[PDB]
Design a protein around this ligand. Structure first.
Ligand SMILES: O=P(O)(O)O[C@@H]1[C@H](O)[C@H](O)[C@@H](OP(=O)(O)O)[C@H](OP(=O)(O)O)[C@H]1O
Length: 297
């Protein structure tokens, strides 16, 4: 009689562990996590893991987690993260819990430079993050240098020799002071409001190439498909909202965008490995279904 498998699921700010059955499905496991967290806006999330070959991967709901080549470790390692992003944080993130998990994930991303962010904006962001952690600024508790141990800015901004840490840190203090009567909840939501407008926010980039053989970037967001030149991942060269796409399919390393736009050329591009296009497709499918449920429903 088969022994249970140990699994470790980690949210941005929590450690969860379960004892799964040899025949448990990704869906049943997802069900457990969500029920345990009390998350309701489930359509945004999913479970992430690394496969035996080393790649990061999204867990398939409709299968036995045991049949998904997830790198064998004692407690199996899983990461609960947001897979899809809303079009407007304010209208779609209702639960206080969902709001927090998005703030925590987006912040990390900013902090790692995964999402470009102008220095002055970065400081402005950092200030809300502290109002959320340290509450209101009290001159007696929050003595100067109360942040010198915090990770607040990306390493990219600190490289601004125009100022120094303590300088940058007091810049943030100014903005912290200005946020006095602000709730924790509200501050995290302002952070999200400011970050959702950043060009690189919510877009999944993929290294691609066209007929010509030229390097190109492919972005999949909640709103459609964007093709970026190489030196610029902020501003698209050609776009394709979900309401402008008639059909998208891939051949081996062949991707065809069929535009609803009756008298417009099909856009075609080639992606490196096959398992890549496989995932690019899954995202398109997802952001598309989420795009519809926002209108037609
Ligand atoms: O029939 P199953 O048990 O789902 O078997 C396949 C498995 O779930 C893959 O992970 C999935 O790729 P995605 O990650 O792109 O879903 C593939 O989809 P496909 O058949 O549409 O390639 C499925 O066929």
């Amino acid at each position: 009689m088969p022994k249970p498998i140990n699994v470790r699921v980690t949210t941005m700010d929590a450690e969860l562990e379960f004892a799964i059955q040899p025949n448990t499905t990704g869906k049943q496991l997802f069900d457990q996590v969500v029920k345990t967290v009390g998350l309701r806006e489930v359509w945004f999330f999913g479970l992430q893991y690394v496969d035996s070959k080393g790649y990061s991967t999204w867990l398939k709901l409709n299968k036995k987690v045991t049949q998904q080549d997830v790198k064998k470790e004692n407690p199996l390692q899983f990461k609960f993260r947001a897979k899809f992003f809303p079009e407007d944080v304010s209208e779609e993130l209702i639960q206080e819990i969902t709001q927090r998990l998005f703030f925590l994930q987006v912040k990390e991303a900013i902090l790692n430079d995964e999402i470009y962010c102008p220095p002055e904006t970065a400081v402005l962001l950092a200030s809300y993050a502290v109002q959320a952690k340290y509450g209101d600024y009290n001159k007696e508790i929050h003595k100067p240098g109360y942040l010198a141990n915090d990770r607040l800015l990306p390493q990219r901004v600190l490289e601004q020799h125009k100022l120094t840490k303590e300088q940058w840190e007091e810049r943030i203090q100014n903005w912290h002071e200005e946020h006095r009567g602000m709730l924790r909840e509200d501050s995290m939501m302002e952070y999200l409001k400011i970050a959702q407008d950043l060009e690189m926010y919510g877009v999944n980039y993929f290294e691609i190439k066209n007929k010509k053989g030229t390097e190109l970037w492919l972005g999949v967001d909640a709103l459609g498909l964007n093709i970026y030149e190489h030196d610029d991942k902020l501003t698209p060269k050609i776009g394709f909202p979900w309401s402008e796409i008639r059909n998208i399919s891939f051949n081996d390393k062949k991707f065809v965008i069929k535009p609803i736009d009756k008298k417009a050329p099909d856009f075609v591009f080639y992606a490196p490995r096959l398992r890549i296009n496989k995932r690019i497709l899954a995202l398109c499918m997802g952001n598309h279904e989420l795009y519809m449920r926002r209108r037609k429903p």
